[PDB]
Amino acid sequence: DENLPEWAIENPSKLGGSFDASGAFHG
């Protein structure tokens, strides 16, 4: 089933962003 994606909901333009040693994203 085609649901409403979670990323289509929240604000897309936020500053910052990086990845840690474990490859996990930090938003």
Partner 1 sequence: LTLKGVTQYYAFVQERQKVHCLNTLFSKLQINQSIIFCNSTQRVELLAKKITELGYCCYYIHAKMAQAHRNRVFHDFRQGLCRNLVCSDLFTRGIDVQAVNVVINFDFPRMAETYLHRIGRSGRFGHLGIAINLITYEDRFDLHRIEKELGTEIKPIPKVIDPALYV
The contact set with partner 1 (CB under 8 A) reads 2, 5-10, 12-14, 16-19, 21-25, 27
- Least CB distance to partner 1 at residue 20 (A): 9
Q: Between vectors from CA 14 to CA 21 and to CA 16, what angle results, nearest 5°? A: 35
CB 26 to partner 1: min, Å: 9
Distance CA 27, CA 14 (A): 8
**Shortest CB 19 distance to partner 1, Å:** 5
Query: What is the SS3 assignment for 18?
Result: strand
